[PDB]
Amino acid sequence: AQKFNGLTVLPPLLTDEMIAQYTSALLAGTITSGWTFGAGAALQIPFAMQMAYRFNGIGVTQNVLYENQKLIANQFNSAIGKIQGSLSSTASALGKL
Amino acid sequence: QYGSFCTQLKRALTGIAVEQDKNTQEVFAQVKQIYKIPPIKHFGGFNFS
Amino acid sequence: TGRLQSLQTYVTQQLIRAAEIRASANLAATKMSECVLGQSKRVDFCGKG
Amino acid sequence: YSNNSIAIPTNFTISVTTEILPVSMTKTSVDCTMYICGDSTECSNLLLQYGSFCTQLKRALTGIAVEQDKNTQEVFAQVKQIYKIPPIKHFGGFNFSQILPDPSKPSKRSFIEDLLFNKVTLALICAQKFNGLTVLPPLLTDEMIAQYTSALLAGTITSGWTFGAGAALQIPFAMQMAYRFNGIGVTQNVLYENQKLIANQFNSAIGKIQGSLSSTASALGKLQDVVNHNAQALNTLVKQLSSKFGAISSVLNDILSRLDPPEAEVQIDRLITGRLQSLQTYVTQQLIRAAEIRASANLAATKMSECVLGQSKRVDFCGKGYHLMSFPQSAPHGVVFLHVTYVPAQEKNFTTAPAICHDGKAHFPREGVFVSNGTHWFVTQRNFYEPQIITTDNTFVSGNCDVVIGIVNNTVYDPLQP
Amino acid sequence: PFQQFGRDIADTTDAVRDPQTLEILDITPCSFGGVSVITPGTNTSNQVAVLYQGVNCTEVSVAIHADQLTPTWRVYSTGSNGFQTRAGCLIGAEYVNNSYECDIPIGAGICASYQTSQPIIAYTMSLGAENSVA
Ligand SMILES: *[C@@H]1O[C@H](CO)[C@@H](O[C@@H]2O[C@H](CO)[C@@H](O)[C@H](O)[C@H]2NC(C)=O)[C@H](O)[C@H]1NC(C)=O
Ligand SMILES: *[C@@H]1O[C@H](CO)[C@@H](O[C@@H]2O[C@H](CO)[C@@H](O)[C@H](O)[C@H]2NC(C)=O)[C@H](O)[C@H]1NC(C)=O
Ligand SMILES: *[C@@H]1O[C@H](CO)[C@@H](O[C@@H]2O[C@H](CO)[C@@H](O)[C@H](O)[C@H]2NC(C)=O)[C@H](O)[C@H]1NC(C)=O
Ligand SMILES: *[C@@H]1O[C@H](CO)[C@@H](O[C@@H]2O[C@H](CO)[C@@H](O)[C@H](O)[C@H]2NC(C)=O)[C@H](O)[C@H]1NC(C)=O
Ligand SMILES: *[C@@H]1O[C@H](CO)[C@@H](O)[C@H](O)[C@H]1NC(C)=O
Ligand SMILES: *[C@@H]1O[C@H](CO)[C@@H](O)[C@H](O)[C@H]1NC(C)=O
Ligand SMILES: *[C@@H]1O[C@H](CO)[C@@H](O)[C@H](O)[C@H]1NC(C)=O
Ligand SMILES: *[C@@H]1O[C@H](CO)[C@@H](O)[C@H](O)[C@H]1NC(C)=O
Ligand SMILES: *[C@@H]1O[C@H](CO)[C@@H](O)[C@H](O)[C@H]1NC(C)=O
Ligand SMILES: *[C@@H]1O[C@H](CO)[C@@H](O)[C@H](O)[C@H]1NC(C)=O
């Protein structure tokens, strides 16, 4: 009904599949090379050592990460799991879009 | 007889339409190469599934 | 007269909303660059804590 | 990717990129009565019955015009004193001749500034002007903006980032680059031992900037778009005077010379309605474009403060790679930043471990990372391969070897023992 | 030979053929522009300067100007006592060769201020103190 009076909707240049591919590439780069892929070539590094670097970046020595790796992984997994309920429950979460 | 209002509106809408694609490109196309996760998912115990 | 006025009003509103969306998209691109492609020391820019 | 393999660069590259930002647009003024009615008193009196639209349009245009000068002032007038480069141009082998002012030309612009000035072509003016439209010159001439950029360049290359926080404290340029290298996580001995190579790479990149600007036609796209948008808006505003808007003619003098007042009022009002509508549309479009230009100018001022007057840790804010420094250049209605950044070049893959087990103690690197070439273990800085013997000064002890996952047995040398 | 009058890109008549002499005359609109009054606060003084924007000083003349014929407007509408800046014709301000911080922006690098004779002065704005790093 809106279209019938000279109004048209142009499809976006990037399909949703292409944007999903872009996000997947960003995720793979982040989890396989840390921040190195954003400054040049992607330099692989074990994820535990990457998190140790991140801990060094906030003022905590990396031995804390290496000695609480299991606890930190458990907390991260729990938070990721809670994200699903956080999105589903609140109706105003996806408010801006 | 009303002049060139139609061309102005057309140009404004075209500019907006191009700007939308520019916005998406700037936000998402920040990666040079399409990296792929390795088939093995052993990341220090972290679970990104 | 009325239809042209309505069209012009629509185009002006679209321009204003496009400016707002462009500001939001620039913020999103900055957050992608500084929070995802790196680690940010800016407080509350990439979340609380 | 594996859980015990790391990649470390063994070389680097100095990369200089260009970022172009609009700062200000053309300051225009419109005479409401002259545009709508020309020089006819009957039309002026009829327009007087429409209220105070003319004052609103005048105020909006004046606000835009003042805001343009404010934008230029905020972007460029960020330096307290007009610094001058020393006559001797010995900066550790770095060659800034292509960005320093050229005194031979009257404008005193640099080589790259002249390329930018010639690359942007203006859009004819008299015809637009003849109908009550005027263009106000900017408060700062191009010479003054060139002087501001020259002062910023001199301060940057003679005092590092110190001149942006207070008095300019001189420092040799090689030592300034060593500080910049320390700022990105690379020890200064790398700079001091590869000074010649780094100077050569910087000079090569500066040389390539000229071809980069000249070749791509869309490089100077934003400034050209601003100029074209202003010219197109003015052309449309003038063209709207040829419309009839339902009247018998688009010329007011013909209406006056062909009709008596009681019949001329209808046609004059029909013209007035359309011309006032066109003027209001022009003012609204100018306001929206002025808001966009103000946002761009605020971004440019932030980049001037954080990329030129300092070294930025923000990723991709001052170019791709690890930011080293930036140089400003003026351009028609805008600014150009030459971002000099550090890019890791030639990476090799080594075996890696999170900690080293020795005498039942776990050693972690103080500032680097443990690497192995296959047989021996070293500790190296993260952004540049420089292996060193694992001692008690490169590492620190924390607990035993029973907690860390992936710890590797190895010996830790002790300087005090021999 | 068949053409009578000419139009520009904006379709405004800019040339015309004389019906009798059959010559081509170019038409240029008579000069116009905005008038700006440059003044320190009335708390300071009542002296003002007048800037005719975007016109040569030679054109400024009371006889044909839209400026009134009141004695003060006669004083401030004579182009003979006028300094020619790129922003236009400035009347009532004296140009000095010193450089100060901008007080009242006129344009094109020209600023104006009030200094204790106590007339309005016009000068080229100073960007700042020159400095040479050792
Ligand atoms: C990562 O987390 C996902 C859940 O988000 C795990 O998948 C679940 O595994 C349990 C146990 O095998 C199943 O009962 C669930 O049905 C699974 N859910 C989904 C959505 O697949 C996954 O096993 C975890 N990965 C690892 C390596 O532990
Ligand atoms: C690091 O890379 C630079 C190039 O950016 C290398 O310098 C070049 O070395 C080759 C020889 O292999 C010469 O032919 C070139 O003339 C050099 N170029 C410049 C600009 O000097 C440098 O050798 C590399 N260093 C290491 C240790 O690999
Ligand atoms: C800095 O680079 C410039 C080029 O951008 C050098 O000037 C060139 O010098 C060569 C050799 O003397 C001449 O053949 C070119 O004609 C010069 N070009 C220009 C534009 O002047 C300059 O010599 C370099 N400075 C130093 C100290 O090496
Ligand atoms: C890993 O690095 C070590 C240390 O540089 C290498 O050991 C050296 O090998 C060379 C052979 O070219 C000998 O001359 C040195 O005496 C060795 N140093 C020591 C301390 O024993 C080792 O060969 C390297 N392994 C590789 C490259 O696979
Ligand atoms: C680097 O990767 C190659 C490819 O598999 C491998 O053969 C080599 O051993 C690796 N280097 C080290 C030091 O592990
Ligand atoms: C790395 O992954 C392999 C494959 O599962 C495993 O055998 C090895 O123990 C892992 N290394 C560490 C340090 O966990
Ligand atoms: C490391 O050394 C300890 C003590 O010598 C020993 O118990 C352990 O098995 C060693 N680990 C490896 C992988 O050789
Ligand atoms: C009109 O008459 C005058 C009188 O001599 C003459 O000079 C002129 O050429 C004539 N023009 C035409 C078009 O007849
Ligand atoms: C004003 O007119 C005079 C006389 O023709 C001329 O010399 C001067 O250059 C003109 N002013 C400008 C700014 O061109
Ligand atoms: C300024 O200097 C010029 C010389 O360039 C001179 O002609 C003029 O009289 C001077 N005016 C003042 C006020 O010093």
Separation CA E31–CA D34 (nearest Å): 12
Closest CA to D89 of D154, D176, D39: D154
Residue burial E117-128, b: 16+ Cβ < 10 Å; e: rest: eeebbbbbbebe
For residue B40, which ligand has an atom nearest its CA? 6
Separation CA A84–CA D218 (nearest Å): 44
Q: Which amino acid is at C7?
A: L
Tokens of A47: 């994820």
State whether residue E48 is helix, strand or coil.
coil
Q: Which amino acid is at E35?
A: V
Tell me if B49 CB under 6 Å of ligand 1.
Answer: yes
| Residue of A37, A54, A55, A62 to mutate, testing the D interface (most D Cβ within 10 Å of its Cβ) | A62
Q: Which amino acid is at D51?
A: G
Question: How close, in Å, is residue B15 to chain C by CA atoms?
Answer: 9
D373 CA to middle of ligand 5, Å? 9
**Residue D17 neighbours by CB under 8 Å, 6+ apart:** D319, D320, D338, D339, D341
Classify residue D166 as exposed, middle or buried by CB count within 10 Å of its CB (0-12, 13-18, 19+). exposed
Taking CA D291 as the corner, what is the angle to CA D61 and CA D281, rounded to the nearest 5 degrees?
Answer: 50
Which residue's C-alpha comes closest to atom 10 of ligand 9? E56
DSSP string, D62-121: HHHHHHHHHHHHHHH---SSEEE--S---BTTB--TTTS--TTSTT---HHHHHHHHHS-
Separation CA A45–CA D3 (nearest Å): 8
Query: Roughly what angle, to the nearest 10 degrees, separates helices D195-215 and D111-119?
Result: 20
Give A-chain residues touching D15 at CB under 8 angstroms.
none
Separation CA D287–CA D24 (nearest Å): 13
**Residue B33 neighbours by CB under 8 Å, 6+ apart:** A25, A42
Give C-chain residues touching B23 at CB under 8 angstroms.
21-22, 25
Instruction: Please answer whether residues A39 and D343 qualify as being in contact, where contact means their C-beta atoms are separated by less than 8 angstroms.
Output: yes
DSSP string, D175-191: HHHHHHHHHTT--HHHH
Identify which of B2, B23, B30 has the shortest CB distance to residue C4: B2
Tell me if D349 CB under 6 Å of ligand 7.
Answer: no
Classify residue D158 as exposed, middle or buried by CB count within 10 Å of its CB (0-12, 13-18, 19+). buried
The pairing of beta strand D408-409 with beta strand D356-358: parallel
Q: Which amino acid is at D249?
A: S
Instruction: Please answer whether residues D387 and D377 qualify as being in contact, where contact means their C-beta atoms are separated by less than 8 angstroms.
Output: no
Place of tokens 């400026």: E67
Tokens of D100: 């320093």
Kindly compute the dihedral angle of the four CA atoms of residues C48, C40, A41, A60, in this order, to the nearest 10 degrees. Answer: -80
Place of tokens 């840790």: D313
Instruction: Please answer whether residues D89 and D98 qualify as being in contact, where contact means their C-beta atoms are separated by less than 8 angstroms.
Output: no
D228 CA to middle of ligand 7, Å? 73
Taking CA D313 as the corner, what is the angle to CA D309 and CA D319, rounded to the nearest 5 degrees?
Answer: 75
Closest alpha carbon within chain E to D128: E10
Give C-chain residues touching B20 at CB under 8 angstroms.
18, 21
Which residue's C-alpha comes closest to atom 9 of ligand 6? D406
Separation CA D372–CA C6 (nearest Å): 72
Tell me if D97 CB under 6 Å of ligand 3.
Answer: yes
For residue D89, which ligand has an atom nearest its CA? 3
Instruction: Please answer whether residues D98 and D112 qualify as being in contact, where contact means their C-beta atoms are separated by less than 8 angstroms.
Output: yes
Closest alpha carbon within chain C to A51: C39
State whether residue A71 is helix, strand or coil.
helix
Tokens of D330: 């003026």
Q: How many CB atoms lie within 10 A of CB D179?
A: 15
In Å, how far from its chain's centre is CA D258? 58
Closest CA to D321 of D369, D383, D368, D386: D383
- The reply to whether residue E32 touches residue D132, judged by beta carbons under 8 angstroms, is yes
Tokens of A75: 């907390």
Chains adjacent to A (≥3 CB pairs closer than 8 angstroms): B, C, D
* Total residue length of chain B: 49
State whether residue D207 is helix, strand or coil.
helix
Atom of ligand 9 nearest to the CA of E84: 13
Separation CA D314–CA E36 (nearest Å): 46
Instruction: Please answer whether residues D81 and D151 qualify as being in contact, where contact means their C-beta atoms are separated by less than 8 angstroms.
Output: yes
Tokens of B47: 């679970």
Tokens of B46: 């972290």
Q: How many CB atoms lie within 10 A of CB D54?
A: 19
Q: How many CB atoms lie within 10 A of CB E103?
A: 15
A33 CA to middle of ligand 7, Å? 30
In Å, how far from its chain's centre is CA A12? 23
Closest alpha carbon within chain B to C11: B9
Closest CA to D250 of E11, A76, E21: E11
Separation CA A56–CA A64 (nearest Å): 10
Tell me if D348 CB under 6 Å of ligand 2.
Answer: no
Identify which of A33, A37, A69 has the shortest CB distance to residue B45: A69
Place of tokens 């009076």: A5
Instruction: Please answer whether residues D8 and D347 qualify as being in contact, where contact means their C-beta atoms are separated by less than 8 angstroms.
Output: yes
Cα of first residue to Cα of last residue in chain C, in angstroms, is: 56
Q: How many CB atoms lie within 10 A of CB D56?
A: 13
The pairing of beta strand E110-114 with beta strand E120-124: antiparallel
Question: How close, in Å, is residue B19 to chain C by CA atoms?
Answer: 8
E47 CA to middle of ligand 10, Å? 24
Place of tokens 């938070």: A79
Separation CA D243–CA D277 (nearest Å): 12
Separation CA E97–CA D227 (nearest Å): 34
Kindly compute the dihedral angle of the four CA atoms of residues C3, C4, C5, C9, in this order, to the nearest 10 degrees. Answer: 100
Separation CA D73–CA D24 (nearest Å): 10
For residue D351, which ligand has an atom nearest its CA? 5
Kindly compute the dihedral angle of the four CA atoms of residues D366, D367, D368, D369, in this order, to the nearest 10 degrees. Answer: 40
Instruction: Give the experimental resolution in Å.
Output: 2.8
Closest alpha carbon within chain D to C15: D288
Q: From residue D117, how far is each of A15, D208, D222, D414, E75 by CA, in Å?
A: 40, 18, 14, 63, 42
Separation CA D343–CA D140 (nearest Å): 38
Calculate Rg over the CA atoms of chain B. 22
Question: How close, in Å, is residue B38 to chain A by CA atoms?
Answer: 8
Instruction: Please answer whether residues D84 and E132 qualify as being in contact, where contact means their C-beta atoms are separated by less than 8 angstroms.
Output: yes
Looking at the DSSP bridge assignments, the partners of residue E107 are E110
Atom of ligand 2 nearest to the CA of D200: 20
Q: How many CB atoms lie within 10 A of CB D238?
A: 23
Separation CA E4–CA D254 (nearest Å): 18
Separation CA A57–CA B4 (nearest Å): 58
Separation CA C42–CA C27 (nearest Å): 14
Give A-chain residues touching D405 at CB under 8 angstroms.
48, 66, 69
Q: How many CB atoms lie within 10 A of CB C30?
A: 19
Is the pair E, D in contact (3+ CB pairs within 8 Å)?
yes
Closest CA to D320 of A35, A39, B30: A39
Looking at the DSSP bridge assignments, the partners of residue E114 are E120
**Residue E24 neighbours by CB under 8 Å, 6+ apart:** E6, E15, E16, E17, E18
Closest CA to E59 of E85, E88, E95: E88
Separation CA D356–CA D409 (nearest Å): 6
For residue D353, which ligand has an atom nearest its CA? 6
Closest CA to D237 of D30, D24, D47, D48: D30
* Longest CA–CA separation in chain E, Å: 76
Identify which of C32, C39, C41 has the shortest CB distance to residue A35: C39
| Residue of A9, A27, A35 to mutate, testing the C interface (most C Cβ within 10 Å of its Cβ) | A35
Separation CA D82–CA E132 (nearest Å): 8
Q: Is the dihedral of CA D29, D33, D37, D40 positive or negative?
A: negative
State whether residue D130 is helix, strand or coil.
coil
| Helix ranges, A1-97 (H) | 16-33, 47-57, 62-67, 69-89
Instruction: Please answer whether residues E133 and D87 qualify as being in contact, where contact means their C-beta atoms are separated by less than 8 angstroms.
Output: no
| Helix ranges, D216-260 (H) | 221-239, 252-258
Q: Which amino acid is at D54?
A: C
Q: Which amino acid is at E47?
A: Q
- The reply to whether residue C19 touches residue D292, judged by beta carbons under 8 angstroms, is yes
Tell me if D411 CB under 6 Å of ligand 7.
Answer: no
Instruction: Please answer whether residues D361 and D389 qualify as being in contact, where contact means their C-beta atoms are separated by less than 8 angstroms.
Output: no
Tell me if D374 CB under 6 Å of ligand 4.
Answer: yes
Q: By a Cβ cutoff of 8 Å, what residues of chain B touch chain A?
A: 17, 20-21, 24-25, 28-31, 33-38, 43-48
Sheet holding E5-7, edge to edge: E5-7, E13-17, E24-26
Separation CA D324–CA D199 (nearest Å): 13
Q: Which amino acid is at D37?
A: C
Separation CA D103–CA D108 (nearest Å): 5
DSSP, res D51: -
Separation CA D324–CA D344 (nearest Å): 13
The pairing of beta strand D361-365 with beta strand D356-358: antiparallel
Q: Is the dihedral of CA D175, D178, D182, D184 positive or negative?
A: positive
**Residue D293 neighbours by CB under 8 Å, 6+ apart:** D22, D23, D24, D25, D68, D71, D226
Identify which of B37, B45, B46 has the shortest CB distance to residue A28: B37
Which residue's C-alpha comes closest to atom 8 of ligand 9? E56
Instruction: Please answer whether residues B16 and C18 qualify as being in contact, where contact means their C-beta atoms are separated by less than 8 angstroms.
Output: yes
Tell me if D400 CB under 6 Å of ligand 7.
Answer: no
Question: How close, in Å, is residue B23 to chain C by CA atoms?
Answer: 6
For residue D202, which ligand has an atom nearest its CA? 2
Identify which of B9, B12, B19 has the shortest CB distance to residue C22: B19
Atom of ligand 3 nearest to the CA of D97: 1
**Residue D88 neighbours by CB under 8 Å, 6+ apart:** none
Looking at the DSSP bridge assignments, the partners of residue D322 are D342
Tokens of D111: 């080589």
Separation CA D129–CA E32 (nearest Å): 10
